[PDB]
């Protein structure tokens, strides 16, 4: 079983996270230090400078030649069992949509791994399980936050064609997009225009206004609009230059010099402190914590803490994990939900209230849940 000293090692690593979150909730709600426009310049700094340098500090120290390949395939099998049962729902049931296929994939299979997940598992099980959580942060930034970006851009590019070309879209040859437009999700006026050719062909051009198609064409429109959203993103330069350095530093034994290693480490020490500070400012700016009713909030904390760790119990036993590697895999599935699935769903308006409960009301009850599996597994 566990000893009473282990309960002090968990509290040593997690009570310093809630202290920086209540000081930011109290300084807006209670004692009123920050104006809501002054409070918007702190979240703008954490999102651009502090956290994309916290993820460089972890990925550049990863050793990609000695990853744990059996643990890392039980994490990539969770997100195929889940993503295939939702495919047998919107293709076989009659009321299945794509607004719910994105939301039920973000709730059940994408937790908060970088800010909360690495200090929590390192205190529960030791310094080897903090080396396994970095291997999961690599696979979310580079695969599962890119597949989810292909779904929001396919959801938006089929609305713009199915609304404006209801009876004609079978004859579209090619679709261009002017470079003024970066997201075609209704925020800009988005005038469209067609070139009628000599034999029933059609050249669609999406423009900026001022006061089904074939799959050889739809897959071309999406890759243009994904590349424009992928180079304006700070987490795609933290993972491009994080992985590229760790492939070189761990083969020829190059150690990064102390001018450059301290120039990065002066801002990334503000990573884990300011991220939890920026997360308590956000739960002070919403009107209520439970912002989606009491039915849709129990639904957000039953996909997250039950259907999560009951589909990595059958995807970790069907691979060959036992002992401690089974216990680390179940506990990291019960982490609260990450923030980047909320950043996407606030922009595209795909249920922004169900994914703002589960980030805020996830964090407040995450600590007596993960300490409830840690007692029950250890028995």
């Amino acid at each position, epitope marked *: 079983m566990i000893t009473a000293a282990d309960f002090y090692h968990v509290m040593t690593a997690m009570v310093p996270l809630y202290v920086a979150m209540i000081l930011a909730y109290g300084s807006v709600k209670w004692w009123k230090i920050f104006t809501p426009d002054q409070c918007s310049g702190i979240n703008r700094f954490v999102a651009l400078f502090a956290v994309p340098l916290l993820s460089f500090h972890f990925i550049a120290a990863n050793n990609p030649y000695a990853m744990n390949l059996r643990f890392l395939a039980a994490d990539s099998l969770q997100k195929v069992i889940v993503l295939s049962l939702l495919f047998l729902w919107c293709k076989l049931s009659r009321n299945g949509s794509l607004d719910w296929t994105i939301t039920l994939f973000s709730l059940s299979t994408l937790p908060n791994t970088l800010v909360m997940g690495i200090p929590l598992l390192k205190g529960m099980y030791g310094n080897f399980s903090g080396d396994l959580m970095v291997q999961i942060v690599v696979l979310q930034c580079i695969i599962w936050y890119t597949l989810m970006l292909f779904l929001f851009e396919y959801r938006g590019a089929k609305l713009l064609i199915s609304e*404006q070309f*209801p*009876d004609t879209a079978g004859s579209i040859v090619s679709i261009h997009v002017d470079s003024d437009i970066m997201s075609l999700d209704g925020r800009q006026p988005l*005038e*469209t225009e*067609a*070139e*009628i050719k000599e034999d*029933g062909k*059609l050249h669609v051009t999406v423009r900026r206004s001022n006061a089904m198609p074939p799959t050889s064409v739809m897959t071309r429109l999406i890759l243009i609009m994904v590349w424009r959203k992928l180079i304006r993103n700070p987490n795609s330069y933290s993972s491009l230059f994080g992985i590229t350095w760790s492939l070189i530093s761990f083969k020829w034994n190059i150690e990064m010099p102390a001018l450059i290693a301290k120039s990065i480490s002066i801002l990334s020490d503000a990573g884990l402190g300011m991220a939890m500070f920026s997360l308590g400012l956000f739960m002070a700016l919403n009107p209520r914590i439970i912002a989606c009713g009491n039915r849709r909030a129990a639904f957000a904390a039953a996909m997250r803490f039950v259907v999560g760790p009951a589909v990595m119990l059958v995807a970790s036993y069907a691979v060959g994990l036992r002992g401690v590697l089974l216990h680390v895999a179940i506990i990291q599935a019960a982490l609260p939900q990450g923030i980047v699935p909320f950043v996407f769903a606030k922009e595209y308006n795909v249920h922004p209230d169900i994914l703002s409960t589960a980030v805020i009301f996830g964090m407040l009850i995450a600590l007596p849940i993960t300490l409830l599996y840690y007692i029950l597994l250890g028995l």
Partner: nanobody
Amino acid sequence: SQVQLVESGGGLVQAGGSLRLSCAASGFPVNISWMEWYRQVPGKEREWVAAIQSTGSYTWYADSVKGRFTISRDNAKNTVYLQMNSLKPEDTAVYYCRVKVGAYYRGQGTQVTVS
């Protein structure tokens, strides 16, 4: 549905002539009267001319073309005619119609050039 536009009326004329352009629409669903006409020089920054919009009450003309270009609606033949009067020599560019059925459809076939 094999949609197709038919444009005509293009020709070479002097300064002070009279032309009668054409835009014959066919092969459509239920159309709304929002057809247009504009210019496209070999340079950039094109300029819009006229409108034959919903009720025929107000027509969005430009500044220099107000009170001199007659636009006309014919919903029977589904063809909007743009009658030009006192044709200024700066009309060498291409003119074409922009019928709107929710998304603007247009062609390219004219011969408008004023000498």
